[PDB]
Amino acid sequence: PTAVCSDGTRVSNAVCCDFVSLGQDLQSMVLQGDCGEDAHEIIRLTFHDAVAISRKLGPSAGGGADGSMLLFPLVEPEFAASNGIDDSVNNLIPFLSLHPTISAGDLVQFAGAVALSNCPGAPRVQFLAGRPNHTIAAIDGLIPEPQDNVTSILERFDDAGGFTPFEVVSLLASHTIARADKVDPTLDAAPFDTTPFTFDSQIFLEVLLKGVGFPGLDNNTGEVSSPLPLGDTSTGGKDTGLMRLQSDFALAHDPRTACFWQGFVDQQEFMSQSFASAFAKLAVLGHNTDDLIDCSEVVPVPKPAVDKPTTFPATTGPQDLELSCLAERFPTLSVDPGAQETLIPHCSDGLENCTSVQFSGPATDS
Ligand code: HEM
Ligand SMILES: [Ca+2]
Ligand SMILES: [Ca+2]
């Protein structure tokens, strides 16, 4: 039955009210209302937690969205595929004792939902609560890596939870606010698109441009040529150049996924709604939704989509595109004016000096 929360929010179940203070503490203590470094890592973690599950291997291989990353921080976060996930894990662990009525599985997914709401253009995702507070650590090998090919990627997602190629491409819209710290051992926070603090479709457009060089080394596993490789890192700046993942390039050109990939270019609402549907399905892996309760009302209303249309970054244009999709014409778009590449800002405020919250904790990396 209904209750109103202490903030005035009408909920279908007063148990949802516990998440209100959790949301406030996640913002005040870690996310700081920003679509920044900490938010991005927490969103990455929702995926690393959820995807470790296998229909063909059965329940013993992993329980999916179960908080296994937080409850066993000495196991999965140190598997090679999750190198660097320690940051988000360590940031979330303290919230387990601060909010003891909330399971680790609920914590991970609610944190992801709140983090998403900080990103302009992101959908207000569904949030179901009631994941059990106990599980065991998943086995290794369940998380896709950027060097994997499309067949492998699609098989893993289908084996994890019956995801279609469309849902896989939809989930990868998340790379619109994604950067890499471990892919290149010489680079920190190399962004996958020119707007890593904006949930827009630039990622879909920019992976389709011809690659011209690298932001760092030229032979990292899982990385391919980038269309906008230059930054100011060679002179001590923090604006790293753009990085392209092999897996994103492969999804953009494979016959099973290429039309879905291009279909999101300049389609803000279609992209954000598609990501939301596939993400809601990701968030309840390992669970029957019948055993969960709907607490979507306590997910914050997200920052609205930006005014800016989808455009070619400075120095690029349609003549630079490598197209693979015959079913739909690539749209006519404007080109950002400028004779040289525009540095991609290290921080959502346009500067380079922002800092992020990092709690110390048991999870580690290399
Ligand atoms: C084929 C599947 C995927 C591959 C191969 C992949 C790969 C990667 C890699 C290599 C990084 C860089 C990590 C680093 O070096 O620091 C990354 C970051 C990230 N991933 Fe993906 N990922 C996949 C799917 C997903 C999904 C399904 C989501 C969420 C729904 C997601 C969300 C993110 C986010 C938000 C970041 C940025 C973290 C940050 O900037 O702090 N990824 N991913
Ligand atoms: Ca898990
Ligand atoms: Ca973006």
Side-chain angles (χ1 to χ4, degrees), residues 1-9 11-366:
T2 87
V4 179
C5 283
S6 75
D7 62 343
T9 299
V11 283
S12 72
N13 187 319
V15 144
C16 296
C17 279
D18 294 338
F19 289 94
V20 178
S21 66
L22 170 58
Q24 288 156 0
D25 290 349
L26 287 165
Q27 295 280 28
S28 67
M29 292 169 183
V30 175
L31 301 169
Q32 300 180 319
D34 189 38
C35 184
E37 177 62 23
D38 281 4
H40 298 165
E41 287 284 13
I42 280 172
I43 294 161
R44 183 188 173 203
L45 174 66
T46 66
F47 169 60
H48 283 238
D49 186 24
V51 80
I53 180 172
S54 173
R55 287 167 165 186
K56 76 185 177 213
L57 297 176
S60 81
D66 57 356
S68 71
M69 291 272 171
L70 306 190
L71 293 174
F72 301 87
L74 309 176
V75 188
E76 294 171 71
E78 294 75 28
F79 288 160
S82 286
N83 188 25
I85 214 71
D86 62 324
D87 286 354
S88 57
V89 167
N90 289 332
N91 274 343
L92 288 191
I93 282 168
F95 294 86
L96 295 164
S97 47
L98 183 70
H99 296 272
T101 60
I102 302 185
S103 66
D106 284 6
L107 173 55
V108 173
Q109 298 304 328
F110 185 68
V114 172
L116 282 166
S117 77
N118 292 345
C119 305
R124 196 180 180 186
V125 301
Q126 174 184 75
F127 174 67
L128 309 184
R131 297 168 187 77
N133 58 19
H134 58 276
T135 185
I136 77 164
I139 65 176
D140 198 2
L142 296 177
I143 294 158
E145 290 190 314
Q147 71 276 18
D148 303 343
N149 64 30
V150 173
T151 293
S152 170
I153 292 173
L154 295 179
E155 190 280 334
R156 181 77 277 281
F157 275 96
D158 173 61
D159 183 52
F163 291 95
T164 57
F166 174 68
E167 296 173 318
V168 173
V169 174
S170 299
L171 286 170
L172 266 83
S174 62
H175 279 189
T176 191
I177 48 171
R179 310 188 292 183
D181 306 326
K182 299 304 191 174
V183 172
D184 190 323
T186 70
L187 300 184
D188 191 46
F192 298 159
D193 82 4
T194 50
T195 56
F197 316 107
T198 311
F199 205 91
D200 53 14
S201 65
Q202 295 297 140
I203 174 71
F204 291 105
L205 178 148
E206 294 161 1
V207 168
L208 285 173
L209 297 165
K210 297 177 208 270
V212 303
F214 298 86
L217 305 181
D218 68 349
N219 66 349
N220 299 309
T221 300
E223 180 179 347
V224 294
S225 196
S226 157
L228 295 172
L230 64 93
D232 61 2
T233 38
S234 62
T235 61
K238 288 184 173 179
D239 287 2
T240 306
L242 194 148
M243 175 180 292
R244 184 183 286 173
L245 299 187
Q246 184 279 158
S247 54
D248 291 341
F249 173 84
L251 290 160
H253 300 289
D254 188 275
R256 288 160 292 185
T257 52
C259 282
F260 297 135
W261 186 278
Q262 186 193 295
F264 286 139
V265 173
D266 198 35
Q267 305 204 49
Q268 179 62 31
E269 183 180 301
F270 175 44
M271 178 198 72
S272 67
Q273 283 304 287
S274 297
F275 171 83
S277 302
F279 187 78
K281 178 172 178 191
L282 178 73
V284 296
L285 288 187
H287 309 275
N288 179 345
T289 59
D290 282 15
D291 305 327
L292 299 178
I293 60 161
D294 198 339
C295 297
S296 295
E297 297 72 33
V298 301
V299 175
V301 176
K303 298 179 182 178
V306 297
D307 291 325
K308 195 171 188 197
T310 296
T311 60
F312 288 91
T315 74
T316 73
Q319 69 282 355
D320 298 326
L321 286 166
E322 296 184 296
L323 303 181
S324 301
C325 178
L326 284 69
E328 186 175 11
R329 183 175 71 83
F330 191 100
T332 303
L333 303 172
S334 298
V335 175
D336 292 348
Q340 75 176 12
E341 280 181 42
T342 302
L343 291 174
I344 303 159
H346 183 64
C347 305
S348 67
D349 63 10
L351 301 183
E352 304 198 359
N353 70 325
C354 62
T355 53
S356 316
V357 171
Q358 184 60 62
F359 299 147
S360 63
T364 59
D365 65 337
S366 39

